């Protein structure tokens, strides 16, 4: 089937709340090798965020039960966590590999580079949420490095209010708080991204102000939450 057809199929699936269909469409769009339009890119991101999002949220519930069952109830909770875990790594591996094979190498301008490097940071972060063993310290560092190169490219080539820059700070700050357990570096990162953007509310535009201001609000809420 052809790109534009697959895109419209993705939009139907989205509308129907059938995100596995939505991801399958956009995966196969990506696999055609062309650079993704940015409507397309957004669709890929929404499908995969909702697909791992369900798993992440089931993982957390069943993990919570596991840690708090003290029988053969724990054996059953463990096996179910692990089954959920494996689906979830299959979702992140899939995105991760589409990012390495098509999306990061096809990225021509700074914007897309930041977008995808961010996404690579996120999906490693989701793997990190769920990793035990020797696995972990390597997954983390993979995440940290995707974020970090993303961050540098954004501080140099995007405005403080670009929603994609602001979003990277927000998620990079979450990585610091939640993965690296460095609350102080997390607050400093969020607070500076909030302040620099707030000093330029003018320069926002009509295509971006809703997204940029909403992310700014979340930087602040996280700030409030982490100072408690």
């Amino acid at each position: 089937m052809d790109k534009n057809e697959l895109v419209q199929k993705a939009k139907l699936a989205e509308q129907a709340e059938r995100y596995d269909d939505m991801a399958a469409c956009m995966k196969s769009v990506t696999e055609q090798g062309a650079e993704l339009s940015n409507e397309e890119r957004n669709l890929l991101s929404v499908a995969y965020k909702n697909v791992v999002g369900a798993r992440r949220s089931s993982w957390r519930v069943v993990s919570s039960i596991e840690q708090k069952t003290e029988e053969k109830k724990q054996q059953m909770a463990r096996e179910y966590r692990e089954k959920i875990e494996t689906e979830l790594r299959d979702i992140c591996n899939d995105v991760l590999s589409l990012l390495e094979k098509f999306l990061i190498p096809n990225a021509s301008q700074a914007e897309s580079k930041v977008f995808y490097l961010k996404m690579k940071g996120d999906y490693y972060r989701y793997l990190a949420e769920v990793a035990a063993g020797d696995d972990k310290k390597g997954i983390v560092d993979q995440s940290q490095q995707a974020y970090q190169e993303a961050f540098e490219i954004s501080k140099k080539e995007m405005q403080p209010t670009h929603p994609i820059r602001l979003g990277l700070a927000l998620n990079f700050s979450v990585f610091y708080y939640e993965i690296l357990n460095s609350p102080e570096k997390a607050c400093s990162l969020a607070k500076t991204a909030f302040d620099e953007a707030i000093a330029e509310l003018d320069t926002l535009s009509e295509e971006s102000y809703k997204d940029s201001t909403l992310i700014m609000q979340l930087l602040r809420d996280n700030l409030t939450l982490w100072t408690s």
């Binding site: 979450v174 708080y177 992310i215 979340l218 939450l225």
Partner: peptide
């Protein structure tokens, strides 16, 4: 629980 970037 922290909040990350939502969908647009």
């Amino acid at each position: 629980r922290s909040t990350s970037t939502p969908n647009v």
